[PDB]
Design an enzyme around this catalytic site. Structure first.
Site, PDB file in Angstrom:
ATOM      1  N   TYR A  35      -0.194  11.401   5.654  1.00  0.00           N
ATOM      2  CA  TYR A  35       0.782  10.687   4.061  1.00  0.00           C
ATOM      3  C   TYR A  35       1.136  11.326   3.266  1.00  0.00           C
ATOM      4  O   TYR A  35       1.876  11.787   2.525  1.00  0.00           O
ATOM      5  CB  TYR A  35       0.107   9.397   4.165  1.00  0.00           C
ATOM      6  CG  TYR A  35       0.607   8.059   5.324  1.00  0.00           C
ATOM      7  CD1 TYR A  35      -0.055   6.330   5.525  1.00  0.00           C
ATOM      8  CD2 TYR A  35       2.046   8.631   5.511  1.00  0.00           C
ATOM      9  CE1 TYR A  35       0.614   5.976   6.862  1.00  0.00           C
ATOM     10  CE2 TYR A  35       2.499   7.662   6.577  1.00  0.00           C
ATOM     11  CZ  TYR A  35       1.673   6.440   6.916  1.00  0.00           C
ATOM     12  OH  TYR A  35       2.327   5.262   8.171  1.00  0.00           O
ATOM     13  N   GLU A  92      25.308   4.594 -12.516  1.00  0.00           N
ATOM     14  CA  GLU A  92      26.725   5.852 -11.882  1.00  0.00           C
ATOM     15  C   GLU A  92      26.845   5.862 -10.457  1.00  0.00           C
ATOM     16  O   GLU A  92      27.224   5.349  -9.827  1.00  0.00           O
ATOM     17  CB  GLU A  92      25.636   6.996 -12.569  1.00  0.00           C
ATOM     18  CG  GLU A  92      25.759   7.680 -13.897  1.00  0.00           C
ATOM     19  CD  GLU A  92      27.980   8.445 -13.934  1.00  0.00           C
ATOM     20  OE1 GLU A  92      27.749   9.842 -13.907  1.00  0.00           O
ATOM     21  OE2 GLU A  92      28.672   8.590 -14.995  1.00  0.00           O
ATOM     22  N   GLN A 126       1.124   4.041  -2.333  1.00  0.00           N
ATOM     23  CA  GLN A 126       0.686   5.962  -2.239  1.00  0.00           C
ATOM     24  C   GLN A 126       1.525   7.166  -2.273  1.00  0.00           C
ATOM     25  O   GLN A 126       1.783   7.527  -2.731  1.00  0.00           O
ATOM     26  CB  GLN A 126       0.384   5.700  -0.676  1.00  0.00           C
ATOM     27  CG  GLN A 126      -0.120   4.437   0.046  1.00  0.00           C
ATOM     28  CD  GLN A 126      -0.796   4.730   1.295  1.00  0.00           C
ATOM     29  OE1 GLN A 126      -1.372   5.453   1.758  1.00  0.00           O
ATOM     30  NE2 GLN A 126      -0.717   4.022   2.484  1.00  0.00           N
ATOM     31  N   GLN A 175       0.882  -1.037   0.446  1.00  0.00           N
ATOM     32  CA  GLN A 175       0.396   0.001   0.354  1.00  0.00           C
ATOM     33  C   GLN A 175       0.593   0.922   0.436  1.00  0.00           C
ATOM     34  O   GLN A 175       0.828   2.447  -0.370  1.00  0.00           O
ATOM     35  CB  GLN A 175      -0.574   0.165   1.530  1.00  0.00           C
ATOM     36  CG  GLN A 175      -1.341   1.534   1.733  1.00  0.00           C
ATOM     37  CD  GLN A 175      -2.171   0.987   2.551  1.00  0.00           C
ATOM     38  OE1 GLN A 175      -2.222   1.842   3.979  1.00  0.00           O
ATOM     39  NE2 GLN A 175      -4.279   1.064   2.087  1.00  0.00           N
ATOM     40  N   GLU A 199      -4.611  -6.017  -0.806  1.00  0.00           N
ATOM     41  CA  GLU A 199      -5.763  -5.415  -0.761  1.00  0.00           C
ATOM     42  C   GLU A 199      -6.348  -4.569  -1.672  1.00  0.00           C
ATOM     43  O   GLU A 199      -5.397  -3.796  -1.939  1.00  0.00           O
ATOM     44  CB  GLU A 199      -6.175  -5.394   0.856  1.00  0.00           C
ATOM     45  CG  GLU A 199      -5.373  -4.249   1.127  1.00  0.00           C
ATOM     46  CD  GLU A 199      -4.832  -3.271   2.516  1.00  0.00           C
ATOM     47  OE1 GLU A 199      -6.381  -3.447   3.597  1.00  0.00           O
ATOM     48  OE2 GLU A 199      -4.167  -2.601   3.528  1.00  0.00           O
ATOM     49  N   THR A 256       4.328   1.540  13.742  1.00  0.00           N
ATOM     50  CA  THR A 256       3.767   0.866  13.420  1.00  0.00           C
ATOM     51  C   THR A 256       2.494  -0.146  13.931  1.00  0.00           C
ATOM     52  O   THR A 256       2.771  -0.272  14.753  1.00  0.00           O
ATOM     53  CB  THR A 256       2.363   1.820  11.979  1.00  0.00           C
ATOM     54  OG1 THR A 256       2.597   2.809  11.919  1.00  0.00           O
ATOM     55  CG2 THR A 256       0.968   1.391  11.768  1.00  0.00           C
ATOM     56  N   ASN A 297       5.335  11.742   0.879  1.00  0.00           N
ATOM     57  CA  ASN A 297       4.703  11.041  -0.026  1.00  0.00           C
ATOM     58  C   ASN A 297       4.713  12.613  -1.214  1.00  0.00           C
ATOM     59  O   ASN A 297       5.366  12.115  -2.226  1.00  0.00           O
ATOM     60  CB  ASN A 297       3.286  10.544  -0.609  1.00  0.00           C
ATOM     61  CG  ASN A 297       3.112   9.641   0.272  1.00  0.00           C
ATOM     62  OD1 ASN A 297       3.245   8.469   0.490  1.00  0.00           O
ATOM     63  ND2 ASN A 297       1.606   9.211   0.858  1.00  0.00           N
ATOM     64  N   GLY A 306       5.718  -4.036   6.313  1.00  0.00           N
ATOM     65  CA  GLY A 306       4.634  -4.603   6.148  1.00  0.00           C
ATOM     66  C   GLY A 306       4.091  -5.669   5.828  1.00  0.00           C
ATOM     67  O   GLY A 306       5.245  -6.484   5.729  1.00  0.00           O
ATOM     68  N   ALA A 355      -3.639  -9.559   2.867  1.00  0.00           N
ATOM     69  CA  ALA A 355      -2.664  -8.331   3.078  1.00  0.00           C
ATOM     70  C   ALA A 355      -1.806  -8.991   4.081  1.00  0.00           C
ATOM     71  O   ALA A 355      -0.801  -9.479   3.720  1.00  0.00           O
ATOM     72  CB  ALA A 355      -2.561  -6.951   3.747  1.00  0.00           C
TER      73      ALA A 355
HETATM   74  N1  LIG Z   1       6.215   7.848   3.473  1.00  0.00           N
HETATM   75  C1  LIG Z   1       4.895   7.027   3.570  1.00  0.00           C
HETATM   76  N2  LIG Z   1       5.031   6.150   4.854  1.00  0.00           N
HETATM   77  C2  LIG Z   1       4.516   4.984   4.446  1.00  0.00           C
HETATM   78  C3  LIG Z   1       3.062   5.377   3.857  1.00  0.00           C
HETATM   79  N3  LIG Z   1       1.656   4.233   3.918  1.00  0.00           N
HETATM   80  C4  LIG Z   1       1.769   4.155   5.050  1.00  0.00           C
HETATM   81  N4  LIG Z   1       3.565   4.068   5.432  1.00  0.00           N
HETATM   82  C5  LIG Z   1       4.611   3.640   6.233  1.00  0.00           C
HETATM   83  O1  LIG Z   1       4.708   2.897   5.626  1.00  0.00           O
HETATM   84  C6  LIG Z   1       4.496   1.308   7.041  1.00  0.00           C
HETATM   85  C7  LIG Z   1       3.220   0.768   6.837  1.00  0.00           C
HETATM   86  O2  LIG Z   1       2.787  -0.730   6.031  1.00  0.00           O
HETATM   87  P1  LIG Z   1       0.958  -1.146   5.932  1.00  0.00           P
HETATM   88  O3  LIG Z   1       0.644   0.046   5.060  1.00  0.00           O
HETATM   89  O4  LIG Z   1       0.954  -1.251   6.911  1.00  0.00           O
HETATM   90  O5  LIG Z   1       2.115  -2.172   4.743  1.00  0.00           O
HETATM   91  P2  LIG Z   1       2.361  -2.398   3.414  1.00  0.00           P
HETATM   92  O6  LIG Z   1       3.478  -2.727   3.652  1.00  0.00           O
HETATM   93  O7  LIG Z   1       1.625  -1.815   2.433  1.00  0.00           O
HETATM   94  O8  LIG Z   1       1.759  -3.641   3.347  1.00  0.00           O
HETATM   95  P3  LIG Z   1       1.063  -5.402   3.932  1.00  0.00           P
HETATM   96  O9  LIG Z   1       1.386  -5.181   5.308  1.00  0.00           O
HETATM   97  O10 LIG Z   1      -0.058  -6.307   3.571  1.00  0.00           O
HETATM   98  O11 LIG Z   1      -0.125  -4.295   3.943  1.00  0.00           O
HETATM   99  C8  LIG Z   1       4.601   1.587   8.294  1.00  0.00           C
HETATM  100  O12 LIG Z   1       5.979   2.049   8.793  1.00  0.00           O
HETATM  101  C9  LIG Z   1       4.112   3.320   7.393  1.00  0.00           C
HETATM  102  O13 LIG Z   1       4.420   4.693   8.400  1.00  0.00           O
HETATM  103  C10 LIG Z   1       3.179   6.709   2.967  1.00  0.00           C
HETATM  104  O14 LIG Z   1       2.027   7.235   2.068  1.00  0.00           O
HETATM  105  N5  LIG Z   1       3.961   7.365   3.029  1.00  0.00           N
END
Ligand SMILES: Nc1nc2c(ncn2[C@@H]2O[C@H](COP(=O)(O)OP(=O)(O)OP(=O)(O)O)[C@@H](O)[C@H]2O)c(=O)[nH]1
Ligand SMILES: Nc1nc2c(ncn2[C@@H]2O[C@H](COP(=O)(O)OP(=O)(O)OP(=O)(O)O)[C@@H](O)[C@H]2O)c(=O)[nH]1
Ligand SMILES: Nc1nc2c(ncn2[C@@H]2O[C@H](COP(=O)(O)OP(=O)(O)O)[C@@H](O)[C@H]2O)c(=O)[nH]1
Ligand SMILES: Nc1nc2c(ncn2[C@@H]2O[C@H](COP(=O)(O)OP(=O)(O)O)[C@@H](O)[C@H]2O)c(=O)[nH]1
Lengths: 429, 106, 426, 429, 426
Positions: free
Chosen positions: D214, D244, D14, D10, D61, D169, D218, D133, D89
């Site tokens: 967030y 490089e 994002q 995810q 997801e 998180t 991003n 994640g 997920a």
């Molecule tokens: N910079 C940034 N960090 C993000 C963003 N979304 C989530 N994170 C960080 O990435 C981690 C979250 O990962 P999740 O969203 O739980 O999981 P995922 O890696 O997408 O995969 P799944 O666990 O299977 O859902 C946490 O440490 C969040 O702080 C985002 O849009 N930007």
């Protein structure tokens, strides 16, 4: 020059109405017959306004041919050319071939002898039947049968829709298809094959739609077929006659059955996306998920392919796109075959139904071929047969219809040497 | 207490029977048990009128008294019955009575 | 193609009124009126059941055979009763005694010639004949005896045209007669050896299926009949309609009978939901196969789950995907590989009409040839012996010019018929 | 020339939507794909009037990829390129890598093999994942895994968002990040790192806002990243290819992880203030409060920095601003490294979101580097792991997902030699 | 993804009406109506709780199990009562006796098969199943016994899909029944060994939280129920919405259960302010964590302050800063390092949806796995022994075909369950 066509069996007739539709559609001849030689090898300029078809229609139930003489196109054929036997269809070879089907044949022939005369130096009859049916398997069996003798001196390319690998319909299907194969085998020139199920995949995976009406599969073959006759018998930068096929396509007398494949199958609504490259479509041809046949090149070595292109195509583009292929090896061609690539180039791009679901590109590749692959498809269809024959299953339905333990057992042995044939001509060096 | 039994229907080889409890406080006699068995085993394929008699696991003798019903027993329902005899029932565990087996540390 | 219905006995007759009550509406034919057909397709194939005389009077081409006036005089004095040409009524004002022997050897044997006469007038109607539909009950005189004769004669006159038989085999729990197994065993005998497609219905398999699958609390006979007639319409008439994959009596016959006995089937309708509420429309298709293939919902008494199948014919009639049809059938064939016999790679015979039952969106008649029906002829055959042994009400047969070897014959025959059917369950 | 990109998880998606936004934004290509080579190393000219992306999207997801196909940009990608596994997920490596994640991989690869073919001599795949994640740690683990073998002959720069130092998180996070590190380590070329928390500081201290969605972090990485590929693969006075990087950026095979840093982070509303000098921004680069990573140069000696500049910059200004730095000593560079300053100069100044909160200067410095500093960050993240593993904590969640006491214990030992590695390559002379 | 609710017993049922009363509005589904949804997002994920049939009739996919007609006949004769397809009502007109044994071994055991039947019809609905929601009270027959069976069967049929259990553990101060600890101890037993996520609510923990945290003076049951249903909506349904950081049953499960027992949680809602006045809007966020993490406000009876936590899941659902969320959680974890267990560096599982509770600006469901709940099973377990010792109302169990070793079993089991939970408080 021309090539008559005999659409036999409800299906062969539905597909017929379809292939017949696509035609006028890309020849500017409204359903009224009138347009405002070239294509004369499929249409006779009868009267001084119309273009009466150049084929016939044979079904033993009226239902299906009836519908043709209701819906526009009603005007297209001659009231005569659509043969029917009010009697009974019967999803059984025997009855359709022997018993009933017999009565009509004469009459049937008469047209393919009356329509075969009217023309000017023809080339053959594109036959349209549905392997596993009653009127489609049986009947034709003797139609093609009576042709191979009355015009041995021509082309007999029969375009079949052989039994879905797992999604068959009739309970007997194999009985009807092991029987149409053995009786037609010693009579056809080249038998094209389009698998009903393996076409659905294309409608699910390469066009997206879980709503595929028969009327669609028909639009499809209705396409691949247009690439065969229609456009080919039509001038171009690399013309390919019907004879050409069987010559460049069959290595051996068995009425060998190549497979039909089309390149650009992409759904309208996608219609705007940037078009595909000459290289991509070429490559799409070597993917076992786009071939109108559940005969995935699971091992079957190609032994001859007739790449019919149409639209804007530079001969080098081809004599390169093919070169790249010839050296992919994972596409392994037979041994005894150095080069087996008949490049057929036409001009006029394809012509998609105004609003069906076919993309509408400016170039396509209707590649057909003989692949040691069908070693499978035949196998899997033969086995079927045995299982039932092994118990006589619906045998009493044929016997009581002028057949015998002979015709079955002796048509089984037939295909047996078709499982060995398609095995020997390949897998070995 | 009562008596735990596994009641099968003669000629079924599919249904694993139904487990019933039987005592003097629940059923005054075999006819009263059979009356409730007609409701719980109520059918029209293996049992003609639902349940009219109870036979041993082998169908050699029919029970007429509640005193012949033992704990963790296996019985058959009949009404003729003609016997196939259908055994069947098998197979099930004797865990309806009690779990003989247990877990183990695997 | 064509067919000529046959209303043997009262039951077979009572049902005639319901089979024709329906069918007509499924063909827009008012009492004596013509084709009011909401469409234009319910006419191109009617012939199968009617005849052209006036131009608004397409008369049902059936036969009404019965030795009890009052009956046909109730069917002819009610609703659609005034559409049959009087010539059709082959009555026998005699004493329609409840004896198989009284309607097969003594009383019926006379009225027969005056029947065959007409069965020929109708057969030689026109075009090409396919077969004859036969309704009756195997638990009475005019039904099992006289109707079982009508066929033995028909099958000598045209061993070519087919013979579907709709029999109301003696329901278990409670029989609507006493000698029942006598009139029955004797008629099944005649069946296993003349007609080549029999659809056995059970007044109590219906009740059930009509009181729990239709919350219907007061299932009058009219109903039962109505439900039955619903199936026999899906079978015949239906297939005489267009379809992506259509069949016809023969296909049905040539795909369903592995061995010449004739074998009996068990019909099952598709959308069988209670009126208001239930009108769930869960009829995408998996819902129809869900239906059709369950135990309850089999007009037969026996339960499929109690014995393999040899053949099955889902004769659907309503626009659907030859994919979601051809497909479903499969899983069904694999989820229940257990009971579906193996020496037939594809037991199922998928059939597919187009136009559905007038007011419905999608239906599918089921014609099963399961080995389960073994456990019914067993029943019947049992009842016989238990009473034959004591020659119970036998004097009513013999005293009518019968034989002590005749009863022996039938039982055995029909009794062996049970045997054979097991030869495949294994 | 090009560089595909696989946004996994995810988050990686994002951030992806973000980095992908900034793109068109500075290339004049509306969300409709159309603009009215150069940048072809990230966009394929599908025909045609459009500019179909040059990447893919992988989440188990639908929720998150779904939102992309709602909000303008909906038009940007191909309906195809956004992979999903309706399934689950699971914030656990195992499941995402092994068990579930497996099923999708093939399909995933297919695109990075279908998109990798269509191009012209590519350079690599910029991977976007979120270390801690389920779909981000696990999955990729094997995605990058299957890449290192299918294209060992390219660049594998994975842009990660490794675990907030105190503000994590997921409860398990470390399990998922000690596992994505060990499995990817032997497969990546250069792993860029951007710390989620240490970016907040920048939003609090260098932009002022306690309301950082967030969608902002991003926009930020969405910036620093634009400085990597976008502009760099874009002509300039001192071009720097992807290769490089890894060359001038990794001293040793460990898929070494440099840190991303940007210079001009100043909030709109400040937008008018007199701009900052070439010297100031340069200097801002050596401040541990502006580096998108809680790895404050607490001791970590830099060992190579790639100062990517963009906008109006005089090479002398740089080859001076850097000189001044090289002699600040309190910025101590490794021993075995004389000069470790890759000066990358681009032309086109940055391009700030029309109205987000980014200043919008006419020159910036996206300096990334390998610093013996992460000796920390890894340490602090490893320790975490132990604490839980020490009690098996959520172990039953992985085991029951096709993993073993092996993969954990044996991936712990893995990083152990990453704590020694990042220690030996520095702190010693 | 999907789930299939289960309304076991009256309570579990009564609550069904409230859980669905809510959820629907949180999905714009009127009685039988369709999706009136103020938005368009309350639909892309509904499936989780409904089914497509008509096109305006998305029917809740739950089960209504109960041996007392009157009940379901109060839920089906009132407000939203006419949305459930009748097929859902698995009643047992028997004597719904207040005996765990009467609804688990003797009376319920019969009605079970006719339930599992449907629980399969709903599971095999479509797409992919996630798990089942289970509501009931551990202080009665149809609740603890029959519902505790429903799961033991469910967990044998799909040991893959999850099982959240919403139990109304026997409130302390006053027991709304007498054998309570009997029906309870016996059901917790079944729980600790089948469902893998249990949310224990206490009718009196609610009153309190409903009479002092909502100046509400007349907290009818409807209310309590309503409050509860508010939490179970934040849990499931919620997470089946988008979010910067979304989770789903599993995440919740795979982040909250360190050890296989299944462990029970204690749900807590966020904005819990009295109507008019209180509408302070102090909901920036520190206000929600202020809330959620206090003693009072824990639907459980026990007070967190009386035992460490193993895991916590603030499932927020309303636009907020992943910074002011991720941050707060921390201080919270440090101000109370005392009780929060240490061998888990980050006990808390921050979750963040987007769309909030229909009419609210910002909320956050709390699902705590604290060791404090030790002091409840203790309670229950005590009550048992004090009365078991004298076999109090035991004849109502045994006399129903039970065992003197059955009660022993449960107590011990559930009693050991207390033990273990302490193994972490230390
Ligand atoms: N910079 C940034 N960090 C993000 C963003 N979304 C989530 N994170 C960080 O990435 C981690 C979250 O990962 P999740 O969203 O739980 O999981 P995922 O890696 O997408 O995969 P799944 O666990 O299977 O859902 C946490 O440490 C969040 O702080 C985002 O849009 N930007
Ligand atoms: N592609 C395609 N296949 C069709 C079509 N109609 C039928 N088929 C297939 O062809 C076979 C059906 O043959 P039938 O329609 O039963 O019979 P028939 O060959 O017309 O002749 P009879 O048996 O005497 O009616 C099945 O395998 C169908 O899947 C059609 O319009 N298009
Ligand atoms: N379904 C059905 N069964 C009927 C009807 N009438 C009589 N039966 C059945 O037929 C059997 C009695 O035979 P009957 O028809 O009176 O014989 P017959 O009139 O002497 O030929 C009983 O099993 C009845 O249930 C009817 O209208 N519908
Ligand atoms: N919150 C809540 N508790 C209830 C409701 N109804 C009964 N209870 C509780 O449930 C217990 C009684 O069990 P009951 O539901 O009558 O059992 P059953 O109906 O025989 O399964 C008591 O502790 C009650 O406080 C309700 O609608 N809401």
């Amino acid at each position: 020059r021309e090539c008559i066509s005999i659409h036999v069996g409800q299906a062969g007739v539905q597909i017929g109405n379809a292939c017949w539709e696509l035609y006028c559609l890309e020849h500017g001849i409204q359903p009224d017959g009138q347009m405002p030689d070239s294509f004369n090898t499929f249409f006779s300029e009868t009267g001084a306004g119309k273009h009466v078809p150049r084929a016939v229609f044979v079904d033993l139930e009226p239902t299906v041919i009836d519908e043709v003489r209701t819906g526009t196109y009603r005007q297209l054929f001659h009231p005569e050319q659509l043969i029917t036997g009010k009697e009974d269809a019967a999803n059984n070879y025997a009855r359709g071939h022997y018993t009933i089907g017999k009565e009509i044949i004469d009459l049937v022939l008469d047209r393919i002898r009356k329509l075969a005369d009217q023309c000017t130096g023809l080339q053959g009859f594109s036959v349209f039947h549905s392997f596993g049916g009653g009127t489609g398997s049986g009947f034709t069996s003797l139609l093609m049968e009576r042709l191979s003798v009355d015009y041995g001196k021509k082309s007999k390319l029969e375009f079949s829709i052989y039994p879905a690998p797992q999604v068959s319909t009739a309970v007997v299907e194999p009985y009807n298809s092991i029987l149409t194969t053995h009786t037609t085998l010693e009579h056809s020139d080249c038998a094209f094959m389009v698998d009903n199920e393996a076409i659905y995949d294309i409608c699910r995976r390469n066009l997206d739609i879980e709503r595929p009406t028969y009327t669609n599969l028909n639009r499809l073959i209705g396409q691949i077929v247009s690439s065969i006759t229609a456009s080919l018998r039509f001038d171009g930068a690399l013309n390919v006659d019907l004879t050409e096929f069987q010559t460049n396509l069959v290595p051996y007398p068995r009425g060998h059955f190549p497979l039909a494949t089309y390149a650009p199958v992409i759904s309208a609504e996608k219609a705007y996306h940037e078009q595909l490259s000459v290289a991509e479509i070429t490559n799409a041809c070597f993917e076992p998920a786009n071939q109108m046949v559940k005969c995935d090149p699971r091992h079957g070595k190609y032994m001859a392919c007739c790449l019919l292109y149409r639209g804007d195509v530079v001969p080098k583009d081809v004599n390169a796109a093919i070169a790249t292929i010839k050296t992919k090896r994972t596409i392994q061609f037979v041994d005894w075959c150095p080069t087996g690539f008949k490049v057929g180039i036409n001009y006029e791009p394809p012509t998609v139904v105004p609003g069906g679901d076919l993309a509408k590109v400016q170039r396509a590749v209707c590649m057909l071929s003989n692949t040691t692959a069908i070693a499978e498809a035949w196998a899997r269809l033969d086995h079927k047969f045995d299982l039932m024959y092994a118990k006589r299953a619906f045998v009493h339905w044929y016997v009581g219809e002028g057949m015998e333990e002979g015709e079955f057992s002796e048509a089984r042995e037939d295909m047996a040497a078709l499982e060995k044939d398609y095995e020997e001509v390949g897998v070995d060096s | 207490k009562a008596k735990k039994v596994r009641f099968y229907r003669n000629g079924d080889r599919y249904f694993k029977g139904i487990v019933y409890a039987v005592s003097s406080d629940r059923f005054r006699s075999f006819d009263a048990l059979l009356a409730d068995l007609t409701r719980s085993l109520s059918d029209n394929i293996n049992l003609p009128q639902g349940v009219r008699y109870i036979y041993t696991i082998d169908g050699s003798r029919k029970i007429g008294s509640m005193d012949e019903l033992e704990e963790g027993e296996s019985y058959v329902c009949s009404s003729d019955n003609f016997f196939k005899k259908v055994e069947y029932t098998k197979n099930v565990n004797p865990n309806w009575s009690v779990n003989v087996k247990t877990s183990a540390n695997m | 193609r064509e067919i000529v219905h046959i209303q043997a006995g009262q039951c077979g007759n009572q049902i005639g009124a319901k089979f024709w009550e329906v069918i007509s509406d499924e063909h827009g034919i008012d009492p004596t009126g013509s084709y009011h057909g909401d469409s234009d397709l319910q006419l191109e194939r009617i012939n199968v059941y009617y005849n052209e005389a006036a131009g608004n009077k397409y008369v049902p081409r059936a036969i009404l055979v019965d030795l009890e006036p009052g009956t046909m005089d109730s069917v002819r004095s009610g609703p659609f009763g005034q559409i049959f040409r009087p010539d059709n009524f082959v009555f026998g004002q005699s004493g329609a005694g409840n004896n198989w022997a009284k309607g097969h050897y003594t009383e019926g044997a006379e009225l027969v010639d005056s029947v065959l006469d007409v069965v020929r007038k109708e057969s030689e109607s026109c075009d090409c004949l396919q077969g004859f539909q036969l309704t009756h009950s195997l638990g009475g005189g005019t039904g099992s005896g006289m109707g079982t004769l009508l066929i033995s004669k028909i099958r000598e006159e045209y061993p070519d045209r087919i013979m579907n038989t709709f029999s109301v085999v003696p329901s278990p729990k409670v029989s609507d007669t006493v000698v029942e197994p006598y009139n029955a065993t004797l008629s099944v005998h005649q069946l296993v050896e003349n007609t080549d497609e029999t659809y056995c219905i059970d007044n109590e398999a219906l009740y059930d299926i009509c009181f729990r699958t239709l919350k219907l609390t007061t299932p009058t006979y009219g109903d039962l009949n109505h439900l039955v007639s619903a199936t026999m319409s899906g079978v015949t008439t239906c297939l005489r309609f267009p379809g992506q994959l259509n069949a016809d009596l023969r296909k049905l016959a040539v795909n369903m009978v592995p061995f010449p006995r004739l074998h009996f089937f068990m019909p099952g309708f598709a959308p069988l939901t209670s009126r208001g509420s239930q009108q769930y429309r869960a009829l995408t298709v998996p819902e129809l196969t869900q239906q059709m293939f369950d135990a309850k919902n089999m007009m037969a008494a026996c339960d499929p789950r109690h014995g393999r199948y040899l053949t099955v014919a889902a004769v659907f009639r309503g626009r659907m995907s030859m994919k979601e049809v051809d497909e479903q059938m499969l899983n069904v064939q694999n989820k229940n590989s257990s009971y579906f016999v193996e020496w037939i790679p594809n037991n199922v015979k998928t059939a597919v009409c187009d136009i559905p039952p007038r007011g419905l969106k999608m239906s599918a008649t089921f014609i099963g040839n399961s080995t389960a029906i073994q456990e019914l002829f067993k029943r019947i055959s049992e009842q016989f012996t238990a009473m034959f042994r004591r020659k119970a009400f036998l004097h009513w047969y013999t005293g009518e010019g019968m034989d002590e070897m005749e009863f022996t014959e039938a039982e055995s025959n029909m009794n062996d018929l049970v045997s054979e059917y097991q030869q495949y369950q294994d």
